[PDB]
């Protein structure tokens, strides 16, 4: 009932892992639009590389294409398809 | 148990004003957006007016912006649209419609409507019904019925026994006869046997005129 | 402002068939976007009731064999297994922009067997020999398609100008239509005469049916 | 090739998910050691509501022990049972 | 400051045992807190060699007969399956704190079966004899366990204050011993005696055995 | 390939100095602790100080802080030890070594060691050794050695026929004789039959007076 020190350092450490990111983040320079969900599920790099002068930054990304509501509030809604950035390799970097 | 009941309509005259009422239960006003949507007799759908309640935001079709103001008092859980500077045009049946709440945010189609409330914009004046029967083996069925006629404004309602006898009922849609008043019949087919012991009598409600006359039909 | 084009107009179509109407929205929507557009149903007399909304999601209560889809400007209402109580107009609106609008709408007629009518005469009521006028009415009962001739015969002469026809909506379970024609007189021009009569045609006829009565 | 409106919806909403916590976060008191790794995956309240007005707060919440190496720099090193916060049911709250 | 006390201090056991060596800290640690104790080999006259760090994980190239564990103020080295070349001093060391400290040592002997010496004994070199001194030396070869008792005689006169013994550390391959007399002598009382003898008595030997020369 | 190679150990006088050093290969001594740790002659483990080569951060037992420094020279990467004020207490093999890097933080134990270098401090002045030859059937097995005498101080180093022949060789430890000068014995088993046609010489070095003596060995 206690996790292991190899266990954790091995989880912990960088990797594509899935992460909610708020749709507002990837599109900052939206005014005409609140979004449902406002959050998506991304394949995105998390995790240590237990050394402070390095960070954990991805390699090779991909682009993934989602359905999200778009409400143009007092106006009107509708369904667009949105293109959101995905990480499918991680890797320590400085 | 979502129910939208309008109310108010009725005759009013060119240059008139009229406030519309719709009554709402089962849901709190405070939550949706309450639209009127109109239909003017044998055509489209044309939606009017919307109103948010909570801060009293409207928007208005073009055709009514200026002459028509549509709210909503939450502590009375009701919505109104005051109505002014009436034209024939404005003539139709108008409904009340809500759109509710999905997502945290109000949707913007038409999830219930209530079942409208008849506004006839004319200088005609108010005629209640004279109601005259339809008297009679055609292969053992029997018809009768009701006719209802010289009446003004629509519309006239018509049941057969207090409600009970609907199977074979056929309530024709009225005529304007060139004389500027309506008509209609409304036919029943029945067992040719019953008519010795049975009795058939129509119902007919005009409330405009506060009309209410029962009239019973039978053979000679 | 979108303006939303309805086709087709009208149809005439069978139990267990299936139908498609579509709605085009007039301004220039990529396929990318979808998910706009609801659909009602609005049977003679009543309130539209929605069907789809979100441009393809089922509304509760709302039979399965009703769907739709669509994306940039064009949607499609789909009904998969049409019934008798079908019969309806189906409006769609978009709801991309304020105002929503509605398109006009499409008559879904439901074409069933051959049926023809059964005919029943009237003769006027005293009371209203009193007033001044006579009405006297004729009926077809239950019956399809909707297209037949009433004539009325006067003493075997033919009458033009003073009667007026109503007609039912299709009936939700039969499919059938019934029809109503009204000959109305003054009372002088009633009491003149013997015999009125009422001559019917109709596809489910093979010949023409009178049905008539003598005054008294 | 193209994620459902529905499936996004139903990913995106209020759950515990896995998420990369820095130990930094959970004993912000520490003056004395570095940790290794420095962070750990915790289970954790995630996603939206889709209701500017509520937000995902956890309901039911148990602790879990972790072998964490604690280094107290130029001193030395040593392998410490560390307990993190976890997020068992979450749901949208005001 | 920690300081680490090791036990045992030494011990004696056959290939194939189990042993078992611990190291307590002399602070409150608790149990919570585990791997910061070091383990090391040293053979004779060689460098330590790291076995364990980290409490209980195994040095990259260390036989997997290693192993560690330990938590609060309590750690233990295994050796699983004793071999003849785990002749050595083990030493542990904490690195909790700064200075990092080291036990005091365990020696470990590898007990073998009995093996009696090989006896040879060695005159003084005439290149010697000229300086003014006359070394003469015993060898006992190849020999366990390490007791033995080694008498020197000259013309059958016993000798005392006059020698000193080196012996060997224990072999890494076969676990035997080696051990040298040296008897240390003027040339002028060198010169005047005949017999030079060394008796050796060892476990592995049912009587005494003696090896001597006559000087010439 | 880690290599670390200390020098500069010998006798030095009571009150005396002495500089060790370590040359580092195989790795950049930036990226890690360097450390020594010293043994005096028949005891334990002692750690003596430690360095951190990038800044330069030094830390030492309380026995030795004042009189010793530890540094590093990063481009020479060489590590340094000077020694001030020794005792006799501070007789010992010296130790290099190193703690590596693991997870981006030095790790607080010692990866690899150098083979030390003896520090003696003595009063007493170098001597280099006299060898004499232990000349010799017991079995078919002869033993033959050389008595390597007289010498200060310690170590030194004997091979036989310059290193091909380590089976059956035993240098005994020096022993201190009651004069102060250390002696010791190798000695060598080999075939009896040998002894006529096959030579042994010894190969005898002590480094602190540079003597380096070869000795043949055979009978009579
Ligand atoms: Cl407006
Ligand atoms: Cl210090």
Redo the contacts with the bound molecule.
């Keep these: 009932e206690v996790v292991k020190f190899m266990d954790v350092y091995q989880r912990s450490y960088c990797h594509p892992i899935e992460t909610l990111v708020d749709i507002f983040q990837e599109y900052p320079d939206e005014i005409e639009y609140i979004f449902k969900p406002s959050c998506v599920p991304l394949m995105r790099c998390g995790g240590c590389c237990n050394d402070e002068g390095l960070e954990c930054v991805p390699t090779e990304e991909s682009n993934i294409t989602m359905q999200i509501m778009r409400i143009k509030p007092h106006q009107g809604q509708h369904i667009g398809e949105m293109s959101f950035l995905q990480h499918n390799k991680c890797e320590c970097r400085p | 148990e979502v129910q939208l009941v309008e109310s108010g309509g009725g005759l009013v005259q060119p240059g008139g004003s009229l406030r519309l009422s719709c009554a709402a239960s089962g849901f709190n006003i405070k939550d949706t957006y309450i639209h009127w949507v109109r239909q003017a007799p044998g055509k489209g759908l044309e939606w009017v007016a919307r109103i948010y309640p909570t801060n009293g935001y409207?928007?208005?079709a073009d055709s009514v912006?200026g002459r028509f103001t549509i709210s909503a008092d939450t502590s009375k859980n009701t919505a109104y649209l005051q109505m002014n500077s009436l034209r024939a045009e404005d003539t139709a049946v108008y409904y009340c419609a809500r759109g509710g709440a999905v997502a945290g945010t109000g949707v913007y189609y038409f999830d219930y409507w209530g079942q409208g409330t008849l506004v006839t914009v004319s200088s005609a004046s108010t005629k209640g019904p004279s109601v005259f029967p339809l008297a009679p083996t055609s292969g053992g069925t029997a018809a009768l019925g009701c006719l209802v006629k010289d009446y003004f404004p629509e519309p006239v309602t018509v049941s057969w026994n207090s409600g009970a006898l609907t199977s074979g009922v056929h309530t024709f849609p009225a005529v304007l006869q060139s004389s500027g008043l309506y008509s209609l019949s409304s036919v029943v087919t029945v067992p040719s046997s019953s008519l010795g012991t049975q009795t058939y009598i129509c119902n007919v409600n005009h409330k405009p005129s506060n009309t209410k006359v029962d009239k019973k039909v039978e053979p000679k | 402002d979108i303006q939303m084009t309805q086709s087709p107009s009208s149809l005439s179509a069978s139990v267990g068939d299936r139908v498609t109407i579509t709605c085009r929205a007039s301004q220039d929507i990529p396929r990318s976007i979808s998910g706009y557009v609801a659909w009602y149903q609005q049977k003679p007399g009543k309130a539209p009731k929605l069907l789809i909304y979100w441009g393809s999601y089922l509304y509760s209560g709302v039979p399965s064999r009703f769907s739709g889809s669509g994306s940039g400007t064009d949607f499609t209402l789909t009904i998969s297994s049409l019934q008798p109580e079908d019969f309806a107009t189906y409006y769609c609106q978009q709801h991309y922009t304020t105002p929503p609008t509605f398109g006009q709408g499409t008559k879904v007629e439901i074409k069933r067997t051959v049926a023809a009518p059964s005919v029943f005469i009237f003769p006027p009521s005293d009371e209203q020999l009193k007033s001044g006028t006579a009405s006297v009415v004729c009926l077809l009962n239950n019956f399809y398609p909707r297209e037949a001739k009433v004539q009325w015969k006067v003493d075997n002469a033919l009458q033009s100008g003073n009667s007026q026809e109503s007609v039912t909506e299709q009936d939700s379970k039969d499919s059938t239509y019934s029809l109503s024609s009204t000959l109305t007189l003054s009372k002088a021009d009633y009491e003149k005469h013997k015999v009125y009569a009422c001559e019917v045609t109709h596809q489910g006829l093979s010949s023409p049916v009178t049905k008539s009565f003598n005054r008294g």
């Design positions: 409207t928007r208005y912006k």
